[PDB]
Amino acid sequence: SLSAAAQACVKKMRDAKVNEACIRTFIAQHVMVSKGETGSIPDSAIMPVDSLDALDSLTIECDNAVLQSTVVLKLNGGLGTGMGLCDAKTLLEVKDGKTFLDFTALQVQYLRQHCSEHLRFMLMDSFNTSASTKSFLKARYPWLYQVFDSEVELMQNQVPKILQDTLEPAAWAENPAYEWAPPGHGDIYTALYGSGKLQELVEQGYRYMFVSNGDNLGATIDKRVLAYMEKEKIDFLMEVCRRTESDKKGGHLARQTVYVKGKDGQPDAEKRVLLLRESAQCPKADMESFQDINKYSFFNTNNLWIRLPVLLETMQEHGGTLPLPVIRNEKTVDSSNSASPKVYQLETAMGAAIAMFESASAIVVPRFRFAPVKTCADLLALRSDAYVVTDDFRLVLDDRCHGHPPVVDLDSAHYKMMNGFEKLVQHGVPSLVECKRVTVKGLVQFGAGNVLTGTVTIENTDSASAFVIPDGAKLNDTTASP
Ligand SMILES: O=c1ccn([C@@H]2O[C@H](COP(=O)(O)OP(=O)(O)O[C@H]3O[C@H](CO)[C@@H](O)[C@H](O)[C@H]3O)[C@@H](O)[C@H]2O)c(=O)[nH]1
Structure with a gap:
């Protein structure tokens, strides 16, 4: 049974008709926070990853069935505040006359012409980005616009900002819309599950989902990764890059060692388990460890592959949620106005799902699959x-x-x-x-x-x-x- 503050968050979220999958996911985080979880992952608690398979080593391509069972989703819900953007980043021009969206649509058009005729393509939008995205497609790619609402857009959830003092939902009389925020891109799983979209996708025969950042225009389907996941029975795969000097905003791969004590005369086998540490989870007094690219040299690309039926099974069996580690992000309710109430915004990162599946792995990819902005x-x-x-x-x-x-x-x-x-x-x-x-x-x-x-x-x-x-x-x- 929940605290008074947590019940105040349930009530607010229910009154606003927030999806129940999202309420459940948020409240489980709210319980963590109220017990002192910050999301922090200290260097003393993790160890670097020393060896992974590499995409450049793979050669086998996946048969057509597998290819046809893959869905492509582009994240498109954040706001790049640091770049002084008040709208979808993917609308900025990247080459003369062409935006991230332009190349994204061209990637999908090409793939449909040369690989899979009926490729399913999705964009995860938010309150702050849905409008401008749809009107862009209306003007330049009508074939996407026609099925925008029907099969393209996934709308991400909004969750209440909570006051630091009490963990109660924040009120902001001047602009109540500021009481709400999207809960990071780890919400993709929640939103897909809560909307019924994930079960639909599984019902229609889709088995894999390939997700990437809207800003990363090198991320597309590579049939060798699909063949690799099939052969190795992998349910979740993170592509990481060898970290460069430019790789300072994001997260890196890490490992823990969990000992499964072995039964029947077979000794307890140490077993590596993989995890993501976003910059926001590094104790800010230890940032130099986070930033040492030799220590943690595998940078998450956010090019992610998910086996949809297993994601669905896992969320059903965890109370209709995916229990990603919460990230307790500090802001003011009006982020512009530092005289406004201090809040926590609970978020998750979709690459954190690597810790959620028994057969989750990571693969090293060359830099031509990662051009972040x-x-x-x-x-x-x-x-x-x-x-x-x-x-x-x-x-x-x-x-x-x-x-x-x-x-x-x-x-x-x-x-x-x-x-x-x-x-x-x-x-x-x-x-x-x-x-x-x-x-x-x-x-x-x-x-x-x-x-x-x-x-x-x-x-x-x-x-x-x-x-x-x-x-x-x-x-x-x-x-x-x-
Ligand atoms: O609520 C949100 C937040 C972000 N995004 C989108 O998600 C993508 C990623 O957001 P971004 O803020 O650009 O990156 P970070 O979240 O900081 O980091 C991600 O991407 C990095 C590599 O670029 C990885 O290293 C990190 O692990 C991964 O979390 C972008 O397309 C955002 O628009 C959403 O859709 N919804």
């Missing part, structure tokens, strides 16, 4: 010539890079927001394919047709006037200044 520094690298468009409409790092993205460092005073970054490339995106690292300090504007090679720094000490670069400039292993 968390910051405008990423968007600069993606927009430039360091990233190329494949025939099947993935963006991938050019071969010259040897799987190392150009290390982009933009002054956060000027380029952290989208409006500032937009002026930086006002007159052109620099050629970056040959740039191992570009650092921009102070207010600066690229010219047209700039070529950067080696380690280039552009610096303006003056901090008043823009340092503008002349068309044609080619900076090589240098620091450029007014």
